[PDB]
Amino acid sequence: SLTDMSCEVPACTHSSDFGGVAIIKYAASKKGKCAVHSMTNAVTIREAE
Amino acid sequence: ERGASLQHTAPFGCQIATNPVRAVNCAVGNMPISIDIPEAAFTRVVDAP
């Protein structure tokens, strides 16, 4: 279970490839694998898990 | 009777040299500068503190 989430983008280039970098700080209840997905169709994330 | 040379009388702070005859560092107007900085010199916002 994730809480106290924050996101910062230190580097971004709008292109066909993964030109954007995002650092997401979180507070997880326990250790485990989490799925990563963009809720906006105009942005796509390289990492799936 | 020659008086002061161009090194002393010239406007815009011109420095005058010989062999070859030339005007150096003319104190006058402005100078546009174009620098094509390579991709490797830059650090992404995410990669920066």
Interface residue A11 vs chain B (CB under 8 A): yes
Alpha-carbon separation of residue B37 from A5, A10, B34, B42 (angstroms):
36, 19, 9, 8
List for chain B the helix, strand, coil content (%; round to 5): 15, 10, 75
Q: Which two tokens stand for residue A34?
A: 């989490």
Give the mutation candidate from A17, A21, A25, A46 for the B interface (greatest B CB count, under 10 A): A21
* Partner-chain contact B47 A8, CB within 8 Å: no
Q: How far is A13 from chain B (nearest CA, A)?
A: 9
**Region of residue A42 (phi > 0: left; psi between -120 and 50: alpha; otherwise: beta):** alpha
Distance CA B2, CA B43 (A): 59
Query: What are the b/e assignments for B17-31, b being 16+ CB within 10 Å?
Result: eeeeeeeeeeeeeee
> Would you state the torsion angle of the CA atoms of residues B8, B11, B14, B16, taken in this order, to the nearest 10 degrees?
-50
Burial class from Cβ neighbours inside 10 Å (0-12, 13-18, 19+) for residue B44 reads middle
Interface residue A5 vs chain B (CB under 8 A): no
Strands (E), chain B: 15-17, 22-24
